[PDB]
From a paper:
In summary, our study demonstrates that [name] protein would function as a purine nucleotide dependent R15Pi enzyme and not as a homologue of the regulatory subunit of [name]. Monomer of [name] protein consists of an N-terminal α-helical domain (residues 1–122) and a C-terminal α-β-α sandwich domain (residues 123–324).
Thus, we determined the structure of [name] protein in complex with AMP molecule. The binding site of AMP lies at the interface of three monomers (chain A, B and D) of the hexameric protein. The side chain atoms of Asn209 and the backbone atoms of Val251 of chain B forms hydrogen bond with the oxygen (O2′ and O3′) atoms of the ribose sugar and the nitrogen (N1 and N6) atom of the adenosine base ring, respectively. All the amino acid residues of [name] protein forming hydrogen bond with AMP are found to be absolutely conserved in R15Pi enzymes. The change in the side chain orientation of Arg124 and Asp290 to interact with AMP portrays as the key interactions required for this stabilization.
Author numbering:
A (entry chain A), B (entry chain B), C (entry chain C), D (entry chain C), E (entry chain A), F (entry chain B): 3 to 324
Write the structure that this text describes.
């Protein structure tokens, strides 16, 4: 029992994609556990422990694909679970949760600035960069490159069905960056004039595969075809612990109405099924580098990032369950 | 100088894409010349000849890329010009136009049917077929395969920006064919479950390359990647004769507002440019077969088709020129 | 309805693969039509017609995959048919069938010796050559080159399940050509030391694909991987005219007992299915040349062989049909 | 110089392949070292040392290719050696050897059951899986996934020349897993209908190459061609430490009579050589993952498995050497 | 007996490469037979027939690789041989040779202008074109493109060992074309900034392979890697008749001193062999188009150019031999 | 301010390529700092420190691309700076420099030897090896393989523009190794007869890419094309640490006159530009192994080498900076 408004409203805003982008989802989730601990009227520590377990279950059960979300939850609740089981009283527990979530948030913010600085060294003056969807990590790189006086242009793919490309196009243009907007279908047509591709990630697997917005794997295919470097800009908390032990990342199937509006789809024949995967999977061979906040790695070093940050927790249960 | 309303109206409708599809555009243009000839008020054959040349020009200057259009005009106008030059009187010239236009129309209808009968033999029971845009020729293949009692399913790509996949989805469904509808970005994600690709063509070049709806070349790339047969259904008048002598096909750049609607687009800053190519070009190494009315060829035999039907004409100027 | 025993024996020996290899099968079918003509006890020219038609159907319904068989029955029966339809009397029909047979049979022998001569020029002193199955056309190339005193070695893949590779190993060893015999699985391992690959063909399609003994496509694939020339030695009567009109070649599935002897298989459980495809299909992009009796072609010129020698016959029914 | 008969029997049964498969061979060598320790009649701790050293050399000189065998002898003898060199007395050495054996033997069994559990997560309901040879690690993956109630089918390649594929077909059929049995040559033909490929390993090198039964590289190659995941199921003790210092793995060449029975071969001429390589080598770029008991790695992380578990031992001589 | 100075001096100037480039060699050879017929002091036709046979033998036996040479010789001597065997008297024979050689020369000149016009349509404004060696055909294309006001730049590879790149670089610069000169080794480094590759040919095979200056096949390899169109500019008389019947083109091995000067090479150890192939062979898959004077073909249509111009003469002896 | 003549002279000789090869340049730079420290007239440690910083800068500003140079300077200067900052007196600082420089030199000599011992194990009896430029590390491999009695032959590419293959040819010949010497353009022509490629490195990046003599990347491309192992012999100090944080390696553009001599070049028009990159970059997918002093790695493990030796240093400024 007993969860605050902010937890529920955040969960609904993740589901509906009013809060979106794997990094932002992650911070939002940490932010929500932070408000539950702030506002909780719990008296006992075991009461609050149980509230935070249940806030965490609600937040995890929103969108499955970007592992940034459970890694945020984990980051807070490994520390909440240790404090609680160590024998922390109420206010010690409240501070552990509140602070762990402030920690993760700040670190996510810092990781992205840093990804931008690292990645922008791989951008050269005159570069035409093609991007996909709307990824804060990818945009940090492009923004920094432009602030360094590299005269760049970005090809923004519209990113059907949900139009994330429109966000990207206005954001980059607002920083002063020349933009070329095209449909997703025009990616091979314009790969010849493209020098660099920069995209984000929702989950990165142990073998180096990249799960990112539907279409990503196509752009990467034709980038390889043309020898255009595919650079994936991605925080360490995009990497997927459980792929270490064989798990496949779930691909989120979103509502048909995102593709065909309700007003039109109801008029269509029964024998047409609309299928709307929100993500696809790009194989490591088509990735040049993964730019984390810890540096440039080849895609196959994803196992090392995981071995050293996340491996230890795979013998344990999730820090929010019974 | 004295041009019937039908010529102008056909022209407006081709430009606007109310009349669309390479094959249909070509028939509409014959038809238009047919009608100018039926309804001409001319008294001398010279006067009719002039109206036909001028109508031909109007029709040519509508859409560049689908060569079926100029080939239709040529079919009619080579015959009209040979009659005029050979001394024909007003009524014999009228008839040569009228009857030439009809022969093209009739031949076009028969060729789409025959293509269906031929391509269908390459479709097998249980096949999943992916297609792109709305191609009458490709549909004839799927439609016939289904009528032969092969249980097929078609993956239809929505085809941005103009949404031609909607036409295709609803049309195939009307015949009883199950459809799976997806965004263009999802073609690689679903290539693994696809057994055949079947698309159409606006122009085929001397070396075997296929100009078709923007996005076609991406679908073929990932099809090759996966060893899925790419079959292009396409009539002999889709073959481009000026490429035998080095010409490159012009790619139509259509209005930004087809991508981002007018309302929205004017709210955007200058430094975003919307680019809307209506076609791309697929190399012959990514085509398994071209299915024409005369049979199955590898794409490299495009030169043979062009030699034995269109080559004779490239010593002469255009049959509508002064 | 009065069919000589030789036709029945021939059909049965084609079925059991006692008579095997695509060219030899073809010659044996012509041979049977020849003996049916010779030994007939037909009063009328219509009684002979009817026997030949019936013998043809029996012979056609033995093994489907190697088009050689029907191209031979065609060669005879096109001529027998045209004779009977110009009102030929009896012994004029009998001789037509007898002399169409001999003519095809002799032209087969000449085409194979000529393929040798043309093919051997692409073999170079020292060459190591890998082959597959037992192909008399492939063997002619290898034998002639050794006769030219080029020092060659042949890698012979054993060719499961029916062990054709043993026939080849002994045949070549009998001309004094050193043989290296290996399992099929070992083709990649030895492809590094291989200089040329030379195989036969059962059917060759209009886009250049080559249907040949199960395994052939695997050898071709790793040959391409290593840039080893794949050379296909194939008479004109291996080219498959029905593929010009969209047809797909059928892949013979032979008895599971060829893989697991009947004694052993009956002891195995029901939930193991044994599948025994006798042919597979190699794409044209992995074939460097086809060596015919008319010359060397790229695989994609199969359509020209077909056009110029068989394309006429497709607009009519099979010559042995009613 | 006093070696118990069990060691000699074990060596001979490893040579004749009555005991086969890389993990089982390893366990049988540890088992033999264990029985030599148990049954020894050695007075001194140096007489036991000397017997174990000698037993080790005998066991090492049976089959070279599967590094499992020496990694097992190492595991025991590193510990037996360190004991004897710290002045251990007799029954302390005997127990060390006895308990190093049991410990390796049990850890082998656990690694294989864990590889099952990790591997099965990458199999999906409906999957068709191709394998090669008979690998207990590969089989554990397949068996566990069927135990999870995923409906799978396994394509089993017969694996010439020694027919290991028969052992696999019966083993899987015995757990109620539908089997499709085919010749090795047919792997490309059925790769289109295959969803996952799962094979074992005899040795795995420092750059990620996988040495496994002859044919394995061919399956991997056409799997890559078709974008079918190739998954290698391999205990840590299959990784080859000497490859870290440049060594190449030796490929066992076994008796020509395994290919052609002795009866038939003696009738064949001298100028046919029969070559029988028992393994081949697959490059890492064709391997999607290696499934170890410690997790899922990209093939290129083989060097980290080696570094962290064996790199120490390379600076000394083999533990059984003088 | 009895050959003029000009025949011998031309033969020596071909050998020494003072006359070079396959087209020019060809015209020079025709020019030489033309002077032998002009200046011959022969009295009988059979005398002159025999002089021209022997002039032709001397000219053929200079450099083997560019088939332009024997096709020039053939073009003259098919016509000389027919006139002579038809019963032509002296002056009829003299005129046949003189005129046939003037014919070939003029046609070669016209073919190159025409290749330039055709090819230049495939060059687009702003194009950076990479070329290799010095090819008149290739230079016609580039020159014409520049005369059309297309603002181009050419990357000229120096073309070791004989520095033909220096000729190319000065010739293009003298017409006004901006040039970038690089070593052969820098071709991949600069393929990313390259839009089009244009090279010539010495011989083109029946299957579409292109034999051209050593290095050509490398540039073509990396052009394919990057999707840069490889366009081969080549007269019909570059196509190689005898590859129709299996012949491999001979690759000319030129003197070691061209690579290492005599003054230096004499000082080098015996165990160093210098190898100097003057040409290599590019496979058809890396060629986009062959631009002949008859139009754009795919590389695989080389067989058609040969079938229709040269096929007929392969049943005959060379028109200069006994 | 007070710099010994040896520092300046070393600097001139590095720029001029009298001292050349990445490994030798690095030793020459340690050596130079060694000598400045031996011969300094300084009295305070501060004065010596300043001379060492200034000499370091002079040495750094010679050639950019081979990172071995800056790594050598760092090895010395990290140790010198830690001593200076930790309060060391004049003589203890002198000694730290002198002895640090010697340790680098000695370690470099030992590492080349060890690389040879390791790489040689990957060379097999009868191997043909192609190499490029003059690499001490690669030569150590070939030299050792030969000394082990493997009959090898080396194809040496001349390496324009500076002709480094001459050095390599004569050096390998001096050991008794047969050499085949070729122009760079001939690498694809001779790749079919090559068994191994063995080249060196100037810099290796975090993602595994190899910067080496211009032309290296072409040889590796066609090697991959042909399944010939590309082995890069290269010391740990060839690994580039600034690439871990996104830096791209600068490619040295050297003087036009190295390509075209001064005499000739001034006779050329303005509108020719000579471009002379001394390096190109080879992607990691085209490298089989890197052979370092610590063993064989796949190229993607470049990050591991960089992490465990150089990563610590990238929080600090350069140890020669103020
Ligand atoms: N759902 C998933 N979860 C994790 N990895 C995946 C998933 N789907 C595909 N992959 C991996 O991503 C790549 C897909 O390659 P392909 O199937 O060849 O497109 C491979 O490296 C797979 O291991
Ligand atoms: N000397 C030659 N004469 C004719 N064709 C050749 C010759 N050498 C190679 N080829 C062809 O050129 C291409 C060479 O491809 P590869 O050997 O894979 O480089 C193939 O299409 C061969 O048929
Ligand atoms: O795939 C998406 C968006 O998914 P959605 O819009 O469906 O959330 C983004 O590229 C990543 O999540 C990374 O973005 P960031 O770098 O901003 O985390
Ligand atoms: O596939 C086979 C034989 O199959 P099978 O044994 O099943 O008939 C041979 O490669 C071809 O028939 C060609 O042989 P030839 O060149 O002798 O026509
Ligand atoms: O290979 C060369 C030169 O060989 P070389 O210099 O050894 O004669 C040229 O590219 C062709 O011969 C075609 O040139 P063109 O188009 O001028 O015929
Ligand atoms: K590009
Ligand atoms: K598929
Ligand atoms: K080979
Ligand atoms: K598949
Ligand atoms: K380019
Ligand atoms: K090779």
């Amino acid at each position: 029992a007993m969860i605050v408004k902010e937890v529920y409203e955040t969960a609904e805003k993740i589901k509906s994609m009013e809060i979106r982008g794997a990094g932002r989802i992650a911070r939002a989730a940490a932010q929500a556990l932070m408000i539950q601990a702030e506002k909780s009227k719990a008296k006992e520590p075991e009461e609050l422990w149980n509230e935070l377990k249940v806030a965490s279950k609600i937040l995890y059960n929103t969108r499955p694909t970007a592992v940034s979300l459970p890694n945020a939850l984990r980051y807070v609740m490994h520390r909440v679970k240790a404090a609680y089981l160590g024998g922390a009283d109420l206010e010690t527990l409240r501070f552990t949760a509140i602070n762990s979530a402030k920690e993760f948030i700040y670190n996510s913010e810092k990781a992205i600035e840093r990804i931008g600085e690292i990645g922008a060294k791989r951008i050269e003056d005159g570069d035409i960069i093609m991007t996909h969807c709307h990824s804060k990590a990818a945009i940090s790189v492009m923004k920094k490159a432009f602030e360094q006086g590299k005269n760049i242009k970005v090809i923004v793919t519209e990113t059907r069905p949900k139009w994330q490309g429109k966000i990207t196009a206005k954001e980059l243009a607002s920083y002063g960056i020349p933009v070329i907007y095209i449909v997703d279908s025009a990616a091979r047509h314009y790969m010849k004039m493209t020098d660099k591709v920069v995209m984000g990630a929702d989950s990165i697997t142990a073998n180096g595969a990249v799960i990112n917005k539907i279409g990503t794997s196509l752009i990467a295919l034709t980038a390889k075809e043309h020898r255009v470097w595919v650079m994936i800009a991605a925080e360490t908390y995009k990497f997927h612990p459980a792929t270490m032990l064989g798990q496949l990342v779930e691909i989120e199937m979103r509502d048909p109405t995102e593709v065909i509006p309700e007003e039109e789809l109801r008029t269509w024949p029964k024998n047409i099924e609309v299928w709307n995967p929100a993500f696809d999977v790009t194989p490591p061979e088509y990735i040049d580098v993964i730019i984390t906040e810890r540096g440039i790695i080849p895609p196959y070093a994803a196992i090392d990032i995981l071995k050293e940050e996340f491996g230890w927790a795979l013998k344990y249960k999730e820090p929010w369950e019974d």
